[PDB]
Amino acid sequence: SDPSSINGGIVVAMTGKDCVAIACDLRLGSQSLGVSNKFEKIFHYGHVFLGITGLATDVTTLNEMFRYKTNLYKLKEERAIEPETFTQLVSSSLYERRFGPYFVGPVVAGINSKSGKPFIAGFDLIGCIDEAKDFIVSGTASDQLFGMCESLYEPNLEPEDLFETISQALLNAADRDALSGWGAVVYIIKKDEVVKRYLKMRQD
């Protein structure tokens, strides 16, 4: 009965040279029982990408909630929301439920369409913003991801190189966690093209 570790799952985001990458596993379980190997944890609202780990009901709820909010934002502002702004919206929305929070570990990733600057950010379940140059980690194998990312990561990686680094960071971290794995997805994000790759990983 620890909400953050019932369903399980992981998300990791990295910055490269004029690019960002965000990756997640596909597992959804009920503790020991694996239930779904198709449960994607990365969503997008225009060019801003959001990965959410934690309690799956809240992952689904928050996706639906941010889709709702970014749609009204776009209608009123007459432009797509930027990563820096969206990050603040996520923080606001989470802290609004300070004493009854969503049991989630969200991760924002995207490129500012105006400045062209790669941007990533992480949050705790209560909305504290964790901005980073290099990488953000979230989920039941966050310790593993921290250890992988801290050793494998180097700055200004090309998209093709960055893909390998993030992919290896997720896979090897997921294989040391019981509640993570069962398939993986990696988003490589350039200024005006986005490639989505499904990784082959061990299915145990």
Binding site: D124, L125, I126, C128, D130
Partner: peptide, 4 residues
């Protein structure tokens, strides 16, 4: 959660 994060907590100097």
């Amino acid at each position: 959660x994060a907590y100097x």
